[PDB]
Amino acid sequence: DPTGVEPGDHLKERSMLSYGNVLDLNHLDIDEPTGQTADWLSIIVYLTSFVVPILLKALYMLTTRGRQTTKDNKGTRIRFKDDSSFEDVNGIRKPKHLYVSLPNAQSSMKAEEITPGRYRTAVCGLYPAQIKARQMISPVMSVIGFLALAKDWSDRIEQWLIEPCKATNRDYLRQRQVALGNMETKESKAIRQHAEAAGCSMIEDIESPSSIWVFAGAPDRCPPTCLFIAGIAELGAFFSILQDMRNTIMASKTVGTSEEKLRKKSSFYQSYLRRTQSMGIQLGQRIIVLFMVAWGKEAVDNFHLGDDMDPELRTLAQSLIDVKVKEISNQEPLKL
Amino acid sequence: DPTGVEPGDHLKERSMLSYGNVLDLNHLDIDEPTGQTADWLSIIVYLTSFVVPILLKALYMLTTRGRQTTKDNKGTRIRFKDDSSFEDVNGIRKPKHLYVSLPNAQSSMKAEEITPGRYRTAVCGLYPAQIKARQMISPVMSVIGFLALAKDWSDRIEQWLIEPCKATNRDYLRQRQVALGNMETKESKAIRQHAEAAGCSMIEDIESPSSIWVFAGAPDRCPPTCLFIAGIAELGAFFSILQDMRNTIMASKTVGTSEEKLRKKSSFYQSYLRRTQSMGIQLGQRIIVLFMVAWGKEAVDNFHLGDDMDPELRTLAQSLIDVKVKEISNQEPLKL
Amino acid sequence: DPTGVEPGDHLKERSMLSYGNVLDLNHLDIDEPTGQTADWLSIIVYLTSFVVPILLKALYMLTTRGRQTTKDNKGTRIRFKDDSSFEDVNGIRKPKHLYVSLPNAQSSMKAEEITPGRYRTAVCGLYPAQIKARQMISPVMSVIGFLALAKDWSDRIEQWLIEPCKATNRDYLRQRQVALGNMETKESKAIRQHAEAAGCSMIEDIESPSSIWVFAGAPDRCPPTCLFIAGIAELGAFFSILQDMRNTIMASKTVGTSEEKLRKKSSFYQSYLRRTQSMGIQLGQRIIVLFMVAWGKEAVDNFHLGDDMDPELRTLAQSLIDVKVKEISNQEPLKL
Amino acid sequence: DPTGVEPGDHLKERSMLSYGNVLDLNHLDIDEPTGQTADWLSIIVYLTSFVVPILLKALYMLTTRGRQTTKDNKGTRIRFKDDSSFEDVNGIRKPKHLYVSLPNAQSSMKAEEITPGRYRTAVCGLYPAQIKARQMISPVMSVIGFLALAKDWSDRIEQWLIEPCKATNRDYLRQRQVALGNMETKESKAIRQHAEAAGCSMIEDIESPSSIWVFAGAPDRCPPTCLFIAGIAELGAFFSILQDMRNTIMASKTVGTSEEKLRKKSSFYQSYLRRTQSMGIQLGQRIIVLFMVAWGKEAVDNFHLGDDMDPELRTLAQSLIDVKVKEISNQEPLKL
C-alpha cells in the first residue's frame, strides 16, 4: 500500500493525521546562551570594507528578488561575487566575496554571522541616500503603502513637527534627544565614529529628506546608526505595526481552518521590540501612538490586500489537488 | 582542515550551516525601471525576417531538447546557425544567425532581448499550423496531459461551445469579442497587419482546429497574435494553472524537509498573470472557471506524476552521498 | 570596439550577458518519430561480420582513449581501418572499414547508425571473455571502483547468492529467470541464435566469472545478449547509479555558481532506464536495492574523487584568465 | 551521386553527419601494460653517445621548425644524418644516425623509443648552457612570454629568493632540498653519475643563470637531470599552467561551436603532472602558487594572443569553402 504506513513508524495502524515535512536538527546547537545578540561592531567593520556596488546589488537580490533567493538556497551560506571587489595580489584581481547566511527555522547562529535581516539592517542604516536615489523599496514595504508615505516626506514630516503636543512636539522630540544624549553606550559612539571615517553620510534628525528611506529595505530591527536620533526607532516600530496589521487583515480575509488563519498572520512587532530593546534602548510608546494618529488611516487606506485568484477557482483546484494527493500517497497535500 | 573554514570567511569558528552556491552579480543592473516589459514590435519584426526551418529547429532545441540546452550554456547568448539563413553578399552565402539569450537568476535583461520564453511565445503565436502538423509538444506540456486534450480538439471545443451558460456560452464569447474589439491597442493592430504580410496564417476564433496548438510549446505569456480573440488568453491561464497544480502535487508527494518541498513547487500562474495583464488586457476569471469545470478532471486524471526511482533506493543512495560529502569537504551535498 | 557589439546583433546596446558557443542546426532533423530506438538486429549482424582484433582496437580507442577521439572528431563519421579486415577481390586485399558515428548535441540519428554508445553496448555484450583476459576497463569505470569489485568476483557473487532473502536469493533469481523465460521477444531469440553461430561465447547466469566484465567498457544500456539472464540488467543499473552518485559528489565538492554545479552532475540512470525499458523489459528495483545493500559502501569507499589542482592555484589562474578575456573580447571566458 | 553515400556504408539512407578522417589502427597494440613509462637510463646513455652539433641541429628541427617536421612525416620513424657523426670502419667515415619517432594519435610506443617529447626533455636536461648561448627557444615558449622572463633571470630569481615566506623562502627551498636528498632513487643517481662523465655541465640550484633555460625547448615532463634540485620541477609545472591558460584564452576568443572551442584548448598540466609524478616525485603545489603570485601577471600581460586574420575575412572565406565542399562531396569541410 503506497498510502498504508511508512517504514520505521512504530505503530501498526494508520494514524488519523497525514505525514508532514521533516525537521532537520543537524544545524541546531543547544549550548548557546539564551541571550546572544549580534555583535554589530564586527558587522559594520566587515560591511564597510567593501565597495558600494556589490552592497547595493546584494541588497537588491535580498530585498526586491528576495523571495526567489530564499526559495533557491535556504539553509546554507551564500557567496556573493562581483567584479568590483578585489584582492590585489601583485596585480592579480582576485575576487573578494560577501558572505551572507540564510538560516533555517531550526538553526543556531553565531554572534557576528550575517543573516539577511542583519544585512538589510546594516546596509539600510549605512547608505540611505543611494537607496533614496535609486528608488529601491522591498516588496514587503510596497504592500503597506511605503511609496505614498515617501512621495512628499519633506512636507509630511514638516506638517507633523508643527502640530501642537498634549508647544509643538518638536520640543518633545528635543527632550527625547537630550534623554538619549544622556543615555547611550560607547559602542554606538564607536559605530558612528567608524562609519563617518568609512565614508557614509550620517543623519542628524528626523527632518532630513532621507529619513524614511532608512526603513525602505525593511530591516528586522532599527539600525545601530540612526538609533539615538530620537524619533527613528519608533518610526520603524510604526512600520512593523503596519506589517502586522496587514498580516492580520490578510489572515482574517481567507476562508479556511483555524491553524492556517493562525499560520498566515505574523508577529513582527514582537521581534522588532525584542531586537531593538536588546540594543540598550527604551521605545516610547507615545511617539508610536502619535504616528498612528497622524498617518495610520492613509497607510491602511493604501494597503495592497490584493485578491490573487478567484476563490471559486482556488477552491475547485485545491479540492482536485486534495483528491489526487489522497489517492496517491500518505502525505498532507500542500496549498495551491 | 579541508572542512574547517574557507579563506576570507570573517568568522573564526565554523558556522552551523554548510556553504552553498555562489551568486554572480556581474550580469545584474540596478538602474532599470521597475516595469520594463518586452517591446513585441521589434521581436516580431526580427523573427519574421527569417525562414521557418531555422525557427522550427530552434523551437525544437528550446522545447523538446530544452533541458539539455539550458544545462549546457545558461547565462550567455546563443548563436543559432543553419544553412537556410543567408546573407547574399555578391553571391556568397554568408550565414545569418538567430540570437537568443538564456538568462541567469541574477540577470537584468533589455527590452527587445529575446529570452527563450519570449521566443517560444512569438514562435507559437506566429506558426501554430506547422507545430500542429509536426506534432511538436514540449515535455512540460506532455506531463499535464496536452496530448489527450489535443486528440479530438475539433469535437471538444464544439461540445464546449454548445453548453448552456448561466443561451449558450458562444454568446458569452461573442460579447467578450465585442468588448475586446472596443478595447485594443494600435500596437497589436500593427502586429496583426505586419504578420499577415509576413506570411503566417492567422486564427479567427477558438473554433479553429489549430487553436490549442498555440500553447503547445508552452509560452510564458499569451502571444501578441491571438490575444484579442476572446477565449485564448484564458485557455493559456488554464494551462498555467494545470502546471501549478502538477507542481504542488509533486511537491506534496516527496518526503523531505520544508524548504525543498517549497523549492519543488512553482508559481507559473502569477508570472503568466503579470506578463499577460502587462500587455493591456483583463483576464476574465469566469472563463477559466468554465474550463476547470469542463476538463479539469480529465487533465488531472491524465497527469504524469511518475515515481522516478524506488524511494528505498533513493534514500539509501542519498544517505551514502551525504556521508561521503560531509567527510570530504564543507559544502552542502546536492540531491541525487 | 572589439568588445562592443557583434555585427548582426539586432540590439544597439551591449547586453549584460556575454556571448557563447554557436549551436549548429545543420545535422538536426525534425520529421523523425518521437520514439525511434535502435534496430539491434542490423547492428549485431554488422558487427559480427568483422574479425575481432579490429573490434577490440576500436573498443580501445573508444573506451580507454575515448576522450581524445571525442575531442578530435566529434560531429562526424569515423572510418576505422586495420590490416585484419579484407575484401578479397581476386586476391587483392582491399581494406574493409568499420563505421562509427560520433554525434553532436544537436543531431538526429538513424535507427541502425552506430554511435559509440551502441558500439560499446554491442561489443561488450558479444565478447566479454577477451575483455576479461586483456583487462580492458574504461576510465569511467575506473573511477567508480570497478577494479576492486572485479578482483574477486567469483567469490563475491558466491557470497551474494548464499545470503538469505526476505530461502536464499538464488530462488528469487530463479523465479525472475522463469518470469523472463515466459516474457521475451523473438528478436532477442534471433540475436542469441545468430551470435551463437557467429562464434562468440554466451553467458548462462550471473554466476559466470566473466559476468561483471559485460559492464567493463561501460555501455549506455544493457546489451541485447545478456538481457534475459535475470540479474544482469539490474547490475548495469547499479553501476549507472554509482556513476550518478560520483557525479553528484563531484558536483557538490566544487565551489562555484549554481549553473556549473548543475552542469557538472549527470543523469545516467534516467537514460539507462529509458533505453533499457525500451527493449521490452521491466527492471525490478528490489534487485538494485539488494546490490546497494550488498556492495554500495565498498564502491563509494573506493571512488576516485581526486582533487586535480590546488584550489588556491585554480582560483588565481581562472581569475587572471577572466580578467584578460574580459579585456580582449566579448565572449564568455571558458574554465581552466 | 558524388555526395550520395559511400561504398561499404551499411545504411541505405544518407546520414545527417558528414564523413570524417580515417583512424588507422595498424600502429596500435593492446597487450601493453597500463603503466609503461620511459626507461630514461637507455635514453640518456643513447643520447650521450653522440656529438653535440647533431643534437642541437635535431633540437632545432624539432623545436623551431617543429611544426613543419610534424606536418611532413608524422606516424613514422625519422633518421637524422649529419657529417659530425662517425662510424670508423678502418678509416671509412660511415654516418651514424639519430632515430626519433613521431607517433600518431593511435600508436602504441615502446619503453625506450624516443618521441620528440622525450628527446626535447633529454636534450634540454643535458645541455642548457648551449641553448642559453644560442638563444634557442621554441615558438610554444615564445607565445607565453619566455623571453621577457629570461631577459633578467639572474636578478629575477634573486628578488624571488629574498622575499619573506609565510625567514625567506630560501629556507623553504633548503628544507625541500633536504626532503629530496632523503627521497630519491638510485636511478637518478646513476643518471647524474653517467652524465657528469659524459661531459655535460650540471646545475646545482635554481640560483644558476642557466636555470630557466632548462625549459626553453618546452619539454613534455621535467628532465631526469635537474629533478631533485628542489624548485625546478615546479617551475616547469608553472610554465605548463601558463600554456594551458593561453590555450583557454585562445579557445574562449574564437566565435564558433562548442566542440571546436573544446578542441582548441589543451590539457598540458595533466600530462605534465602524470609524467612527472610517475618518475618518483611529489610536486609541492605551494611553490607553484608562489610563482603564480610572483610573475603570473607579467607573463599573461606578455602573452602573444595574436589575431591572425580579420574575422570578417575569415567568416566570408570559410563560408565560401563550406558551400563549395558541400556542393562537391560528402566530406566534412576543414577549417581555413
Author numbering:
A (entry chain D), B (entry chain D), C (entry chain D), D (entry chain D): 80 to 245, 260 to 429
Sentences from the paper on this structure:
Expression of recombinant full-length HTNV-NP in insect cells led to formation of recombinant NCs that have a diameter consistent with native NCs. Cryo-EM images collected on a Titan Krios enabled structural determination of HTNV-NC at 3.3 Å resolution. HTNV-NC is a left-handed helix with a pitch of 68.03 Å and 3.6 subunits per turn. The structure of NP80-429 is composed of a core comprising residues 117 to 398 (NPcore) that defines two lobes surrounding a positively charged groove. As a result, Nt- and Ctarm of the same subunit embrace each other: residues 97–98 of Ntarm contact residues 423–424 of Ctarm, revealing a unique intra-arms interaction specific to HTNV-NC. Successive subunit interactions rely on exchange of their Ntarm, and Ctarm that make intimate contacts with the core domain of neighbouring protomers, resulting in a buried area of 2704 Å2 at each NP-NP interface. The two β-strands of the hairpin (residues 155–160 and 177–181) interact with the Ntarm residues 101–103 from the following subunit to form a 3-stranded β-sheet. In addition, the β-hairpin152-181 tip (residues 162–175) acts as a clamp and seals the C-terminus-mediated contacts between NPi+2 (residues 409 to 419) and NPi+3 (residues 385–390), thereby buttressing and rigidifying the metastable helical form of the HTNV-NC. Consistently, three nucleotides with a partial occupancy can be visualised for each NP. Conserved residues R197, R314, R368, R146 and K153 interact via salt bridges with RNA phosphates, in line with the versatility of RNA sequence to be incorporated by NP. The nucleotides bind in a continuous positively charged groove oriented towards the interior of the NC.
In particular, the Hantaviridae family comprises the virus Hantaan (HTNV) that gives rise to haemorrhagic fevers with renal syndrome and the virus Sin Nombre that is linked to severe pulmonary illnesses with fatality rates up to 40%. The Bunyavirales genome is usually divided into three RNA segments enwrapped by the viral nucleoproteins (NP). The resulting nucleocapsids (NCs) protect the genome and serve as a replication/transcription template for the viral polymerase. In this context, HTNV-NCs are intriguing as they were shown to be able to form rather rigid helices of 10 nm diameter within viruses and during cell infection.
